[PDB]
Design an enzyme around this catalytic site. Sequence first.
Site, PDB file in Angstrom:
ATOM      1  N   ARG A  59      29.116  23.662  47.424  1.00 61.26           N
ATOM      2  CA  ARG A  59      28.910  24.924  48.122  1.00 61.26           C
ATOM      3  C   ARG A  59      28.454  24.731  49.566  1.00 61.26           C
ATOM      4  O   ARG A  59      27.987  23.653  49.937  1.00 61.26           O
ATOM      5  CB  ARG A  59      27.899  25.777  47.350  1.00 61.26           C
ATOM      6  CG  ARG A  59      28.430  26.279  46.009  1.00 61.26           C
ATOM      7  CD  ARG A  59      27.439  27.161  45.267  1.00 61.26           C
ATOM      8  NE  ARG A  59      26.363  26.376  44.671  1.00 61.26           N
ATOM      9  CZ  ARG A  59      25.154  26.218  45.198  1.00 61.26           C
ATOM     10  NH1 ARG A  59      24.835  26.802  46.342  1.00 61.26           N
ATOM     11  NH2 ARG A  59      24.269  25.444  44.591  1.00 61.26           N
ATOM     12  N   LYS A 205      31.384  32.035  42.869  1.00 61.30           N
ATOM     13  CA  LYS A 205      29.995  32.298  43.222  1.00 61.30           C
ATOM     14  C   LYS A 205      29.792  33.495  44.135  1.00 61.30           C
ATOM     15  O   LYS A 205      28.718  34.088  44.147  1.00 61.30           O
ATOM     16  CB  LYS A 205      29.369  31.057  43.833  1.00 61.30           C
ATOM     17  CG  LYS A 205      29.202  29.945  42.837  1.00 61.30           C
ATOM     18  CD  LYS A 205      28.188  30.317  41.758  1.00 61.30           C
ATOM     19  CE  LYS A 205      27.834  29.071  40.968  1.00 61.30           C
ATOM     20  NZ  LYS A 205      26.838  29.304  39.883  1.00 61.30           N
ATOM     21  N   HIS A 224      21.815  33.064  36.159  1.00 55.63           N
ATOM     22  CA  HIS A 224      22.508  31.794  36.370  1.00 55.63           C
ATOM     23  C   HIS A 224      22.099  30.995  35.130  1.00 55.63           C
ATOM     24  O   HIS A 224      21.089  30.273  35.131  1.00 55.63           O
ATOM     25  CB  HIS A 224      22.000  31.113  37.625  1.00 55.63           C
ATOM     26  CG  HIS A 224      22.735  29.856  37.963  1.00 55.63           C
ATOM     27  ND1 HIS A 224      22.125  28.766  38.545  1.00 55.63           N
ATOM     28  CD2 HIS A 224      24.036  29.517  37.799  1.00 55.63           C
ATOM     29  CE1 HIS A 224      23.018  27.807  38.720  1.00 55.63           C
ATOM     30  NE2 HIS A 224      24.184  28.240  38.275  1.00 55.63           N
ATOM     31  N   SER A 243      22.203  24.328  39.718  1.00 54.25           N
ATOM     32  CA  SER A 243      23.452  23.593  39.735  1.00 54.25           C
ATOM     33  C   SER A 243      23.268  22.147  39.258  1.00 54.25           C
ATOM     34  O   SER A 243      22.352  21.449  39.701  1.00 54.25           O
ATOM     35  CB  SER A 243      24.018  23.609  41.163  1.00 54.25           C
ATOM     36  OG  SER A 243      23.978  24.913  41.713  1.00 54.25           O
ATOM     37  N   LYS A 247      22.969  23.173  32.090  1.00 56.04           N
ATOM     38  CA  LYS A 247      23.452  24.365  31.408  1.00 56.04           C
ATOM     39  C   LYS A 247      24.723  24.139  30.607  1.00 56.04           C
ATOM     40  O   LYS A 247      24.775  24.441  29.420  1.00 56.04           O
ATOM     41  CB  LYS A 247      23.678  25.500  32.421  1.00 56.04           C
ATOM     42  CG  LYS A 247      22.426  25.861  33.209  1.00 56.04           C
ATOM     43  CD  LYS A 247      22.622  27.145  34.009  1.00 56.04           C
ATOM     44  CE  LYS A 247      23.744  26.999  35.032  1.00 56.04           C
ATOM     45  NZ  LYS A 247      23.532  25.803  35.897  1.00 56.04           N
ATOM     46  N   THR A 248      25.748  23.597  31.248  1.00 53.86           N
ATOM     47  CA  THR A 248      26.999  23.379  30.550  1.00 53.86           C
ATOM     48  C   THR A 248      26.876  22.313  29.465  1.00 53.86           C
ATOM     49  O   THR A 248      27.300  22.512  28.332  1.00 53.86           O
ATOM     50  CB  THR A 248      28.113  23.021  31.532  1.00 53.86           C
ATOM     51  OG1 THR A 248      28.354  24.144  32.387  1.00 53.86           O
ATOM     52  CG2 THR A 248      29.388  22.666  30.781  1.00 53.86           C
ATOM     53  N   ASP A 262      27.788  29.675  32.626  1.00 56.60           N
ATOM     54  CA  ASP A 262      27.192  29.704  33.954  1.00 56.60           C
ATOM     55  C   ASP A 262      26.632  31.012  34.493  1.00 56.60           C
ATOM     56  O   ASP A 262      25.587  31.022  35.155  1.00 56.60           O
ATOM     57  CB  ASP A 262      28.230  29.162  34.956  1.00 56.60           C
ATOM     58  CG  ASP A 262      27.647  28.938  36.332  1.00 56.60           C
ATOM     59  OD1 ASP A 262      27.963  29.705  37.262  1.00 56.60           O
ATOM     60  OD2 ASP A 262      26.840  28.000  36.475  1.00 56.60           O
ATOM     61  N   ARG A 326      34.864  18.424  39.338  1.00 57.23           N
ATOM     62  CA  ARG A 326      34.939  19.577  38.459  1.00 57.23           C
ATOM     63  C   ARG A 326      36.271  19.742  37.752  1.00 57.23           C
ATOM     64  O   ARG A 326      37.220  18.991  37.967  1.00 57.23           O
ATOM     65  CB  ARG A 326      34.674  20.838  39.289  1.00 57.23           C
ATOM     66  CG  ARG A 326      33.311  20.899  39.944  1.00 57.23           C
ATOM     67  CD  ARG A 326      32.273  21.543  39.001  1.00 57.23           C
ATOM     68  NE  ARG A 326      30.925  21.527  39.569  1.00 57.23           N
ATOM     69  CZ  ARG A 326      29.893  22.236  39.121  1.00 57.23           C
ATOM     70  NH1 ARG A 326      30.042  23.046  38.082  1.00 57.23           N
ATOM     71  NH2 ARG A 326      28.713  22.111  39.706  1.00 57.23           N
TER      72      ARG A 326
END
Length: 517
Positions: A59, A205, A224, A243, A247-248, A262, A326
């Site tokens: 980002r 995003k 988030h 980030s 989480k994933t 996400d 990614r």
Amino acid sequence: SLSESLAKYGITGATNIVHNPSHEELFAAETQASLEGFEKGTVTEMGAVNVMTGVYTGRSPKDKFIVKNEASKEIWWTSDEFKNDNKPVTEEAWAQLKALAGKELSNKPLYVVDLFCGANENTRLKIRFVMEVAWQAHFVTNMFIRPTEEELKGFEPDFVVLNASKAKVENFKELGLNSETAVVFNLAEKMQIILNTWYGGEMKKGMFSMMNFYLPLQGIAAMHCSANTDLEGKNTAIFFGLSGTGKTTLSTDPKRLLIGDDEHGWDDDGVFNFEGGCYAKVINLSKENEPDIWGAIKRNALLENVTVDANGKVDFADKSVTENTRVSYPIFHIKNIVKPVSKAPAAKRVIFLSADAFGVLPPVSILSKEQTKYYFLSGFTAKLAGTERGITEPTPTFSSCFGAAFLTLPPTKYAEVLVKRMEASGAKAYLVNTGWNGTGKRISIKDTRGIIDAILDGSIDTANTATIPYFNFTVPTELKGVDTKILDPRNTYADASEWEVKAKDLAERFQKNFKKF
Ligand SMILES: Nc1ncnc2c1ncn2[C@@H]1O[C@H](COP(=O)(O)OP(=O)(O)OP(=O)(O)O)[C@@H](O)[C@H]1O
Ligand SMILES: [Mg+2]
Ligand SMILES: [Mn+2]
């Protein structure tokens, strides 16, 4: 019709318009031999197409701006007292930026994709994406909720996103920008423009940030976080985290049904996903360690910045260019998912993931009511794996609500609604270190998953506990299927004094940081 709509966005003379292209149409387009530079798509042995995005492997928060006007009067603007990514720009700068994007996308073949952001019809946003690059249209087709052919008829957008990555802002200095790159939002004209940055995430995003504005104003939490349920579809759990912090990875559980990984909302009905796909990290990926993600990587998925050679062989371990490699893909590329809609009941377990590069936070702390709000607002963790351009090494940070870079309202607003929902569902909160400890290495994923298991099945509820000094963290002295030694942050240090000095320092840093609230 469509051309008349584009005209209003400032785009004219389109030579061809592809409306909501199918995956097969996207594949053919992506694999054309004449594609140059960042537009080139390569077919990997996985069967999925891979693209490169140059230096834009993360980002660009320093290049994110919001037009200051009546429509953005409630925006949580940046200030010396509390710095954030919400930087203001003038209408005058906007007209020029918009014109720049418009000219770039004019007189050429274009892709127009109409999608939904938000699994619930009553609060979702209809987004119309316009771009000249096929894989970009593929990216949004994977990450957003795909409307049926009936819903596409008479589709009227609520927000327009113009991806003009091929254009750059050379006179950014006089327009009040930070660099030639620019990601600007105008809530009056309800439009997002992307200039000089090919990172895929900018396309998801941005609208996430917009959902983070409207939803909380409707008493609906915008989060988030990843979220899943048991195989029965109950006992929903959510995982907050900055980030690249887990989480994933941790929401990926064989004993769970994935809601989303996400972006999620939490309304009167429950937890719902904003997206229709997953934008997962693939660095160091292996079929054995990540069966699901690996299996999800097939035709119609889009690899991003992974190393691929002539034969189309992929090296998921190469992070020389970036470790923020990614892959995006429709959520239905995963077997264990909630259906037919990505939504579930109110969360019963709320987990705050923190990658503590200081090695002070215990693997798992059982938070009180006051601590739940306090640590959620503090959002102490770290910027890592190149999730933001420039960040290479673990950088400690206080990212409010574990997603400050996407917050468009004051963090207190997010905390307010979250606590409200947690109180109504009787949810319990926990602080989990997915970061480092005394060993100088990150806490084992095996132990972390074991901790996650104890949280989701209630085991932790009756575990023996102790108190960690300075922070007054309540931690379990032991858990089934978890290495005992790591539970206490002090055990991985030769001399407990090492941890103490760091804990004491970190503690006051929290104190000072919380003052900005
Ligand atoms: N104990 C741990 N718990 C979770 N992840 C860990 C742990 N130790 C190492 N990791 C690594 O940290 C990374 C977490 O990535 P993940 O994709 O889960 O981040 P994320 O929170 O989903 O980020 P984003 O919001 O950017 O997609 C993975 O590379 C994972 O292997
Ligand atoms: Mg993720
Ligand atoms: Mn994220």
